[PDB]
Amino acid sequence: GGSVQIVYKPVDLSKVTSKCGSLGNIHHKPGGGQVEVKSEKLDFKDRVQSKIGSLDNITHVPGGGNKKIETHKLTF
Amino acid sequence: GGSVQIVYKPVDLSKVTSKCGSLGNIHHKPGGGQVEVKSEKLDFKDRVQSKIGSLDNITHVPGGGNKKIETHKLTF
Amino acid sequence: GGSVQIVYKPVDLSKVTSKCGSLGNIHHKPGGGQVEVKSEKLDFKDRVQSKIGSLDNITHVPGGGNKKIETHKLTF
Amino acid sequence: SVQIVYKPVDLSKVTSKCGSLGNIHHKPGGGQVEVKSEKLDFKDRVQSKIGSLDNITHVPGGGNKKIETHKLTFR
Amino acid sequence: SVQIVYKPVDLSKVTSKCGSLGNIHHKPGGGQVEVKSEKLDFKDRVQSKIGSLDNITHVPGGGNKKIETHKLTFR
Amino acid sequence: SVQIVYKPVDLSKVTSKCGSLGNIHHKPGGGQVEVKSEKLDFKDRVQSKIGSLDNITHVPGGGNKKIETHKLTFR
């Protein structure tokens, strides 16, 4: 007869990846030799950030989000 | 006879990748020899950032987002 | 007879990649020999950034986003 | 008839006198040594020697090689 | 008839006298040594030697090689 | 008839006298030495020697090579 065959076999092996921030870095022996601050007064007021001989690693990642939308429709 | 065959087999092996920020770097023995600040007064007021001999690694990643949209439609 | 065969087999092996910021760098022994600041007063007011012998690595990545849109449509 | 007499004679000397031999050091005096150090930074390997009076002898050499070969062949 | 008398004689000397041999040092005096160092930075290898009086002898050489071949062939 | 006498004689000397041999150093005096250093930066290898009085002897040479060959061929 006038038969109909539909085979709907879509295949997804895809990857969505975010690598965001500080990844796979090497920090080998970081630091200064000598740091000296000599004063009679240190007077810090009203939103002061002071760093003296410090080591800081700071990572902020507001991003790196993944959105995947997939839709399938078969209508006979 | 007057038959119909439809074979809907799309294949996706694709990659969507973000690599954002500080990735795979080498920092080998960073830092100054000597840092010296001599004063009688240090007077810091009202939104001061002071760095004396510090090492900072700062990474901000608001970006690096991935969006994937895929749509499939078969109408007979 | 007057049969119809449709084979719909598109294949996607594509890569979409962003590499944004500080990637794969080598920083080997960075830093000054001697840094000296000599005063009677340091007087810092109202939105001051002061760096004395510091090393800073700063990476901002608002970008590096990926958008992939794919649509498939078969109508008989 | 054939007669072969093979009588080579070796009384030879091979000698090395290498380094510091037969010296006289009568009352050697090293002075006062002062090494004052502050606020130094070293990022790589340091080798340091400090002292008043050194006698140093180093001998990688002074080796002897003697090769001797005797071949007597008849017919 | 044939007669062969192979009788070479070796009384030879091969000698190396290398370095500091037979010296006289009578009351050698190293002076006062001062090394004052401050606020120094070194990014790579440092080799340092400090001192008043040094005797240094280094001998990579003074090696002897002797080679001696004897061949007698009859027929 | 044939007679061969092979009687070479070697009384030779090969000698090397290399470096500092047979010297007299009567009351040598190194002066006072001062090395004042501040605020220095070195990006690469440093070799430093500081001192009042040095005797340095270095001998890479003074090696001896003796090669001797004796061949007697009959027929």
One-letter amino acid of A35: V
Q: What's the resolution in A?
A: 2.5
Q: Give the length of chain B.
A: 76
Question: What are the angstrom distances between the C-alpha of E8 and each of A15, D13, E14?
Answer: 89, 16, 18
Report the relative pairing of strands B4-8 and C4-8 from DSSP bridges. parallel
Neighbours of F4 (CB within 10 A): 13
Cα D39 from Cα B33, distance rounded (Å) = 8
Q: What is the DSSP letter of E29?
A: B
Concatenated DSSP letters of D3-49:
EEEE--EE--EEEEEEEEES-EEES-B---EEEEEEEEEE-S-EEEE
Task: Please state, in angstroms and rounded to a whole number, the distance separating the CA atoms of residues C41 and A39.
Answer: 9
- Separation in Å, CA of B73 to nearest CA in chain A: 5
Residues forming beta bridges with residue B21, ordered by sequence position: A21, C21
For residue C31, the surrounding DSSP H or E stretch is none
- Cα(B17)–Cα(A66) distance, integer angstroms: 10
Sheet holding B11-12, edge to edge: A11-12, B11-12, C11-12
Residues B48 and C50 sit within 8 Å (Cβ to Cβ) = yes
Taking the C-alpha atoms of residue E73 and residue E75, their distance in angstroms, rounded to an integer, is 7
Output the CA–CA distances (angstroms, integers) from residue B52 to A54, C27, C29, in the order listed. 9, 20, 18
- Residue F19 · residue E21 · CB < 8 Å: yes
Q: Give residue E6's region: left, alpha or beta (phi > 0; psi -120 to 50).
A: beta
**Nearest of B19, B27, B31 to residue A25 by alpha carbon:** B27
The residue of chain C with its CA nearest to that of E43 is C29
* β C15-23/B15-23 pair status: parallel
Token code pair at residue A54 = 């410090």
List strands edge to edge, sheet with F2-6: D2-6, E2-6, F2-6
- d(C-alpha F4, C-alpha E27), whole Å: 64
Mutation pick from E16, E25, E47 vs chain D, by most beta carbons of D within 10 Å, is E16
**Partners of residue C35 in chain B, C-beta under 8 Å:** 32, 34-36, 53
Nearest chain B alpha carbon to C38: B38
Residues forming a β-bridge with D32 = none
Structure tokens at B69: 């949209």
User: Which residues is D50 bridged to in the sheet?
Assistant: E50
Q: Are F52 and E32 in contact (CB under 8 A)?
A: yes
Check: CB of residue C17 under 8 Å from CB of residue A18: no
* Best C3, C9, C28, C35 residue to mutate vs chain B (most B CBs within 10 Å): C35
Beta-carbon separation of E43 and D44 below 8 A: yes
Contacts of C12 (CB under 8 A, 6+ apart): A14, B10, B11, B12, B13, B14, C70
CA dist D10 → D6, D69, E8, E68 (Å): 13, 12, 9, 10
Compute φ and ψ for A4, nearest 5 degrees: -125, 130
Solved how? cryo-EM
- In the block, residue with structure tokens 């008849």: D74
Distances (CA, A) of A69 to A39, B72, C76, D25, E33: 61, 11, 25, 92, 79
Q: Which among E28, E51, E68 is the nearest to F51, CB-wise? A: E51
A8: β partners: B8
